[PDB]
């Protein structure tokens, strides 16, 4: 197992706001067997230090939800530990390829297994960006069939109080 380099001179004061989920590269059996009836999903990001401050917004069975999180940093710029907030423990988190105007690609790892995510800052995504992300999926040693593509419509933000998790 080996670690990719993060985005050089990344900055959470400039990489910020919304990011609509395009797709996820992962080997995990959940997306293979449960993965049907998937949900519209987006990241939302703000500065607090070297560590990113983050939310995910998502629908669950037609009700909108928010996952608040802090990406506590590893001492390396653009590398984080997900603050180990539950018994699954830490997740290694990285920003790997991006331009803050149009797209972001993230790597996430736990229990020795790599996974990757593609985002665009608005509804559409370029096929050149999607082709570059498939190389990041192949650098995660995954196939394009282990890419799962998420709802290109029906995104949500600003959920009510009882639909934010407060995980931090």
């Amino acid at each position: 197992i080996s670690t990719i380099q993060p985005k050089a001179n990344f900055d959470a004061q400039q990489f910020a706001g919304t990011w609509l989920l395009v797709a996820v590269g992962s080997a995990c059996r959940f997306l293979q067997e449960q993965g049907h009836r998937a949900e519209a999903t987006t990241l939302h990001v703000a500065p607090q230090g070297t560590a990113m401050a983050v939310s995910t917004f998502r629908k669950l069975d037609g009700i909108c939800w928010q996952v608040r999180q802090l990406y506590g940093d590893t001492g390396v710029l653009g590398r984080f530990l997900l603050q180990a907030r539950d018994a699954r423990g830490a997740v290694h988190v990285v920003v790997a390829e991006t331009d803050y105007q149009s797209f972001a690609v993230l790597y996430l790892e736990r229990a020795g297994q790599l996974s990757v995510k593609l985002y665009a800052r608005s509804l559409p995504v370029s096929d050149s960006v999607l082709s570059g992300f498939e190389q990041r999926v192949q650098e995660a040693h995954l196939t394009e069939d282990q890419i799962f593509y998420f709802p290109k419509y029906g995104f949500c933000e600003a959920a009510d109080q009882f639909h934010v998790l407060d995980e931090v």
Partner: peptide, 17 residues
């Protein structure tokens, strides 16, 4: 009770308790 998993995109209910 709800949990989220960043490594596989599930918002789901925990086996605890």
């Amino acid at each position: 009770e709800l949990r989220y998993d960043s490594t596989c995109e599930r918002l789901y209910y925990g086996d605890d308790e």
